Each structure stands twice: as structure tokens, then as C-alpha cells.
Design a protein around this ligand. Structure first.
Ligand SMILES: Nc1ncnc2c1ncn2[C@@H]1O[C@H](COP(=O)(O)OP(=O)(O)O)[C@@H](O)[C@H]1O
Ligand SMILES: [Cl-]
Ligand SMILES: [Cl-]
Ligand SMILES: [Cl-]
Ligand SMILES: [Cl-]
Ligand SMILES: [Cl-]
Length: 459
């Protein structure tokens, strides 16, 4: 079996959907091939907030931001190892990308609230309905069906087809145990996501990683796009940088979205009843700090006042129910009860919270310099959650230019081959900031579809 399209997109996350829609919008034929039985990838299960400097929501909220500040926050957050041009192009196209999701894809974002992720100097992450990628991927799927973009699931790309000139002209894929050839007359877009679910590749590129947990990310994120492209001499970079998310389930390592209250004033409290790290630091910094606390865990403590702004309990009822059943989260009326349920010394917790309340009133966190400002915690009820870090995201991957063209080991364009999203390795440096993967995947997915659509037809 064979198919022919102008643009063959590998992967049905945000990058691949963005590329596919742009290819169709240019009048080209296209397909998305997806290895798993269902679409969406990591982009579906992510919280799916998206950083933008200069958004309509910041205007609604009276928040001042700038592209310069967003670029600086991003580059500093990855130890200045990110490619500056890749970061600049991400930031320069962020407003257009978000407005395109709103107006073309019909994604619904909250008009009056934003997340400030760790490492960001102001609130700048747009929030999709429901605080997950379900809204985004569902809207993408509807739009793809409307415009006629086929999605072939259970179709695993295995080999890039290269002609004698070095141009990529198709993809061989496995479907139901048979090889299917996809001829790509204008381009192939690799949009396969990261490699954090490939435990062997983790081991190869970072032999000292945390091994307490298996993968709890998307099972399709196994590095196949890197492997296939390296076989045809694509370059890869930054492969050893592999990030832990700091606030994960102690029993499984899964990301706890309910603890997104951290972006709205929740405090991290160790077993001694003390704060120990700035709650809006970088993910690596916080993860390292938690691992240094007694038992290698932290508590996350917040109140109804914070829920009334953040809504993370309302939005993540499955997590609430499961953590509560497992004795990993409690809702209590008083700070004394919050201490008692987790064996925290009461006098120490009360003293810490007295300090927090003072720092909230003055705006000056004398202990850890909270970059947004703490929130008073004198009134309950309270939620308290036990958490630990776990490995979740790969920073490395394919080398591309800002046009998404894949580069070989000499830095030369591989004709007909584009890559976008979490498969690429040049945006985030040593350490991704929250909310920036979505900005990257949409900006570069769109560019990849535009560039593949204009690439000349293979005769
Ligand atoms: N070999 C492959 N063939 C086809 N699809 C693949 C292959 N490897 C990974 N994928 C898919 O690519 C998608 C990547 O989506 P996602 O993880 O959201 O990445 P991004 O955020 O970069 O869009 C996943 O649904 C994953 O199953
Ligand atoms: Cl600006
Ligand atoms: Cl974060
Ligand atoms: Cl590396
Ligand atoms: Cl949930
Ligand atoms: Cl992320």
C-alpha cells in the first residue's frame, strides 16, 4: 500500500496539527501519520498553557510585558544554552500563534486569568478551557476534519526515504504489521515529540538520571523522529539535558496539575515545617531542592483564597479524588490540622506561615524572594499535598534553523525535511520554562507546514 501527498506530517500533537492545518491552508494535500491509536501526544495530557508577551488577556488584566523580557526570561532559564534566534522567533510569533488558535482553530482561553510559571518575570501564560490540552486537541481534530486533513492512526513512521540528491521524498511506516509508503512531493515534517518515555535513550544520554519512577508521560514519546533523522545524517544537540517536573505524585511520578496553585501563592513546606526554595524558581532548581529535603519530598499548601483565583482543585477533580483516597492530599479547616495530617511540627509550620503572611502584606519575601509575591494563608480551609520530583521532559533533539529546516552534521539543510516541536533541541537550553513548550510547538509547527507547502514539487 502507498499514498502520495504534498506534505507528510509525522505526529498528531500540537506541532503536527499546526503544520497540517497550515499545509492545507496553502492549498496543498497533506496527511498526519500517528503511531498510537489515538491522537494528541504529550500536547493532550499537558496543562497546555501557552506563554505570550503582549496578549489580549494581558491587556484585559492590565499586565505589562515585552518581547525583550520574555526572550530574556527564556534564555536565562536555560542557562543561555538555547539558540537565541530560535527563542527570538518563538517570542516574535507567539501573539500570532495564540490568536490563530483562538480565531482559526476556535480554542477557548480564559479571558481574565494567566499563569506565571517558574522562571517568568510576569504572568504571561494563556489558559485553555479546562486547564489541559483536551480542549486544544479536540478543537484541532474538529478543524482537521472540517478542512479534509486525514489522520492515519496506528501508523508508525520507521524510515525516511531519501533520493540520490539527498532530498527527503517520503516515509515508510508500519501499519498492522505491513509497510506503507508515503510519498511526500513537497516535504516531510517530523513532529514526533520528545523521548522521555524511551527508558533506554534516557540511560544512554544521561546515565545519572533519577530512576525512582518509570515514565508517566505519553507512551509515544520515544525518540523515533531523532533516530530516523540521524540515520540520514541529521544533527542532534543537547541530548543529555533531561528535566524533572518538581511536583509529582510520590507513588507514580505523574505530574500533579492540581498543584498549579503554586503559580498563585501556594507554598512548598518540608517535613520540618519550613520553606526551603522559591516557589517560582526554575523546575531544575526546585527539583534539586526538594530532593535535598527530608525524605526527598515536599508538601504543597494552599487555601480557599488561592483556589478562588486559581481554580486548580475545581479543574482537576480526578487528581483530587485519587490523591485523597491514597492519603497523599487532605482538605482541612486549620493550619494545625494541616500539620497534624502529615506529621509536620505544629509550632514550626505556624511560625513559617506567620512569616508568609507578613511577606505577603509587604510584598517582600525575605526568605526566598518570591518573584510575584506571597499570598496570605491565615484563613482556611486548606489543601495540603505530598509531592516529589520526577523525570518528564527532554531538552535535546534535532537541529533545525528558524525556518524548521533540518540540518545535517555540517550544518547544511537536508532538502525536503522539516521538524517542529518537542522533537527539536534548540529552544529550551538546559531547562525548559513552563508554558514555553506550547509556544514553541505552535509557532514552529505553523512554520514547518508553511515551509513544507512552499517547497518545490519533487519531479
Ligand atoms: N514513529 C512515529 N510515527 C508516528 N507518530 C509518532 C512516532 N513517534 C511519535 N509519534 C507521535 O508524535 C506525537 C507527538 O506529539 P507530542 O508529544 O504532543 O509532541 P509536540 O508537543 O512536539 O507536538 C505523539 O502523538 C506520538 O505518538
Ligand atoms: Cl514588546
Ligand atoms: Cl514551572
Ligand atoms: Cl547534552
Ligand atoms: Cl484530574
Ligand atoms: Cl512542559
Amino acid at each position: 500500500m502507498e499514498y502520495t501527498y504534498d506534505v507528510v506530517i509525522i505526529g498528531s500533537g500540537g506541532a503536527g496539527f499546526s503544520a497540517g492545518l497550515e499545509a492545507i491552508a496553502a492549498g496543498r494535500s497533506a496527511v498526519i501519520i500517528e503511531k498510537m491509536p489515538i491522537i494528541g501526544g504529550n500536547s493532550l495530557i499537558s496543562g497546555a498553557e501557552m506563554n505570550v508577551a503582549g496578549s489580549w488577556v494581558q491587556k484585559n488584566m492590565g499586565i505589562t510585558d515585552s518581547k525583550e523580557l520574555f526572550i530574556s526570561d527564556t534564555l536565562k532559564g536555560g542557562d543561555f544554552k538555547g539558540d537565541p534566534e530560535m527563542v527570538k522567533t518563538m517570542v516574535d510569533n507567539a501573539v500570532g500563534a495564540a490568536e490563530w488558535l483562538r480565531d482559526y482553530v476556535k480554542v477557548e482561553f480564559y479571558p481574565d486569568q494567566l499563569f506565571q510559571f517558574g522562571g517568568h518575570s510576569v504572568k504571561r501564560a494563556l489558559i485553555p478551557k479546562g486547564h489541559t490540552g483536551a480542549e486544544v486537541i479536540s478543537k484541532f481534530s474538529i478543524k482537521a476534519d472540517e478542512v479534509g486533513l486525514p489522520i492515519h492512526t496506528n501508523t508508525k513512521a520507521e524510515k525516511l526515504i531519501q533520493d540520490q540528491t539527498g532530498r527527503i521524498v517520503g516515509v515508510e511506516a508500519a501499519h498492522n504489521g505491513k509497510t506503507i509508503t508515503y510519498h511526500a512531493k513537497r516535504g516531510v515534517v517530523i513532529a514526533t515529540g520528545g523521548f522521555s518515555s524511551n527508558m533506554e535513550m534516557r540511560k544512554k544520554y544521561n546515565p545519572e538520571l533519577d530512576e525512582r519512577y518509570g515514565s508517566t508521560g505519553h507512551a509515544g514519546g520515544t525518540g523515533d523522529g531523532i533516530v530516523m533523522a540521524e540515520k540520514i545524517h541529521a544533527a542532534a544537540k543537547n541530548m543529555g539535558y533531561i528535566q524533572s517536573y518538581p511536583i509529582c505524585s510520590p507513588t507514580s511520578g505523574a505530574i500533579a496539575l492540581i498543584a498549579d496553585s503554586r503559580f498563585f501563592g501556594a507554598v512548598l513546606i518540608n517535613q520540618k515545617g519550613e520553606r526551603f526554595v522559591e516557589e517560582l524558581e526554575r523546575r531544575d532548581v526546585i527539583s534539586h531542592a526538594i530532593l535535598a529535603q527530608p525524605g526527598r519530598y515536599t508538601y504543597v499548601l494552599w487555601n480557599q483564597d488561592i483556589e478562588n483565583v486559581a481554580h486548580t482543585v475545581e479543574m482537576h477533580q480526578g487528581e483530587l479524588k485519587e490523591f485523597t483516597k491514597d492519603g497523599l492530599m487532605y482538605k482541612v479547616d486549620t493550619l494545625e490540622e494541616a500539620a497534624k495530617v502529615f506529621n509536620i511540627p505544629e509550632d514550626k509550620l505556624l511560625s513559617t506561615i506567620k512569616d508568609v503572611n507578613h511577606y505577603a502584606a509587604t510584598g517582600k519575601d525575605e526568605a526566598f524572594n518570591h518573584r510575584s509575591g506571597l499570598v496570605d494563608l491565615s484563613k482556611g480551609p486548606y489543601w495540603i499535598l505530598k509531592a516529589t520530583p520526577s523525570v518528564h521532559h527532554t531538552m535535546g533533539g534535532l537541529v533545525v534553523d528558524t525556518r524548521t529546516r533540518v540540518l545535517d552534521e555540517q550544518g547544511k539543510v537536508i532538502p525536503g525535511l522539516f521538524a517542529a516541536g518537542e522533537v527539536t533541541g534548540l529552544t529550551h537550553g538546559t531547562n525548559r520554562l513552563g508554558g514555553n513548550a506550547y509556544t514553541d510547538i505552535i509557532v514552529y509547527g505553523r512554520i514547518a507546514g508553511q515551509e513544507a507547502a512552499k517547497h518545490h514539487h519533487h519531479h
